Design an enzyme around this catalytic site. Sequence first.
Site, PDB file in Angstrom:
ATOM      1  NE  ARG A 180      -7.293  -1.119 -13.463  1.00 27.57           N
ATOM      2  CZ  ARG A 180      -7.457  -0.890 -12.394  1.00 27.57           C
ATOM      3  NH1 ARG A 180      -6.393  -1.125 -11.628  1.00 27.57           N
ATOM      4  NH2 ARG A 180      -8.275  -0.250 -11.599  1.00 27.57           N
ATOM      5  NE  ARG A 181       2.477  -3.995 -14.309  1.00 19.37           N
ATOM      6  CZ  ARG A 181       2.994  -4.566 -12.850  1.00 19.37           C
ATOM      7  NH1 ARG A 181       3.424  -5.693 -13.113  1.00 19.37           N
ATOM      8  NH2 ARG A 181       3.240  -3.717 -12.141  1.00 19.37           N
ATOM      9  CD  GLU A 201      15.427   3.267 -11.113  1.00 25.35           C
ATOM     10  OE1 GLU A 201      16.069   4.085 -10.423  1.00 25.35           O
ATOM     11  OE2 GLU A 201      15.657   3.091 -12.130  1.00 25.35           O
ATOM     12  CD  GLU A 258      -0.745   4.775 -11.217  1.00 29.12           C
ATOM     13  OE1 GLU A 258      -1.894   4.329 -11.829  1.00 29.12           O
ATOM     14  OE2 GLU A 258       0.316   4.292 -11.022  1.00 29.12           O
TER      15      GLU A 258
END
Lengths: 140, 140
Positions: free
Chosen positions: A9-10, A39, A82
């Site tokens: 979690r950011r 990217e 994910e």
Amino acid sequence: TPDVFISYRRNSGSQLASLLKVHLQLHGFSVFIDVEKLEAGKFEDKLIQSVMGARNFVLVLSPGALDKCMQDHDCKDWVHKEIVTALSCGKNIVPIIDGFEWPEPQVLPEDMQAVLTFNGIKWSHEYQEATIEKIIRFLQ
Amino acid sequence: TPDVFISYRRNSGSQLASLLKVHLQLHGFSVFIDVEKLEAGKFEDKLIQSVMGARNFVLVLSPGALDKCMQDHDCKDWVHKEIVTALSCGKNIVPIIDGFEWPEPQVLPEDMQAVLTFNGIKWSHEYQEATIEKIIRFLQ
Ligand SMILES: C[C@@H](c1cc[n+]([C@@H]2O[C@H](COP(=O)(O)OP(=O)(O)OC[C@H]3O[C@@H](n4cnc5c(=O)nc(N)[nH]c54)[C@H](O)[C@@H]3O)[C@@H](O)[C@H]2O)cc1)N(C)C(=O)NCC(F)(F)F
Ligand SMILES: C[C@@H](c1cc[n+]([C@@H]2O[C@H](COP(=O)(O)OP(=O)(O)OC[C@H]3O[C@@H](n4cnc5c(=O)nc(N)[nH]c54)[C@H](O)[C@@H]3O)[C@@H](O)[C@H]2O)cc1)N(C)C(=O)NCC(F)(F)F
């Protein structure tokens, strides 16, 4: 193909998740974490392929880290995306517990309830090197 | 004797501080953080002495980190104590800004207000490597 994908979690797990990337890289493992390996192009595509190409799925269980997963019934939360991929591909899932309270299965979406069935590692501030050695024993 | 003393808040900065330790040692600095290097004896003297022996004093400003220093008249909060030692010894103070809001100086006890006059370095999750290198350049 990197061998360890770090999902986190950011919000409450950015520091631990980076501290895990460094540590595993010091022991030779090829590590995916978004702010360094995600990217160019359509990230939906590439994030899913990064989970698919990594034998090891390290999931940072920081406090409240599966709350956005709960009632994400259309699978549009990214830790949710994910986990399902990791479970779907049979990845060596390794949760990392940092002040995380375990949900009951019933509050999570069915397609990711299996994530509660994997042995997790408790993060110990006071014994970090031992925790790193344990996380590395778990890796394949 | 270590070159770098890390000061942090156990409840908000424990991860970044450990992240700072791993990176700095990697670059060949001898790093003091309490969990790894505070050892036997009366901590209230082991701690102050270790701030005195390190040329560099790295301060982890996670969210709210200086809150418990506010209204600490008798200097009994440890972040307060470590900070005052670094100031009174003319140390190389390098604050690390992790979502921290600068308080007005007069909310902080007089003997640590000067800590706000030092050049802080913003921690960038996206540009962690760049951030580490800037921290190294600040270090003596
Ligand atoms: C969509 C987003 C993302 C990537 C990976 N993940 C994985 O899913 C878990 C984290 O998810 P979280 O629930 O914890 O947080 P989030 O959902 O809010 O993330 C999105 C948040 O970032 C910001 N935001 C949104 N859009 C962009 C963008 O186009 N470009 C940049 N620079 N920032 C962007 C905004 O603030 C937003 O709100 C992890 O396991 C990731 O691996 C989730 C989300 N994304 C593309 C980037 O980051 N790209 C930068 C990077 F990562 F490559 F460095
Ligand atoms: C007093 C405490 C301390 C040491 C260094 N500092 C510096 O001051 C900043 C920290 O900021 P904080 O505001 O977070 O400090 P705190 O008051 O909250 O700490 C109290 C909490 O620690 C635990 N606690 C308390 N008492 C003991 C103890 O006797 N023995 C063990 N094992 N744990 C202990 C508990 O959990 C408690 O609740 C940093 O810059 C430190 O460098 C502050 C406090 N201390 C001696 C240890 O830790 N020793 C273990 C270590 F550090 F070596 F790993």
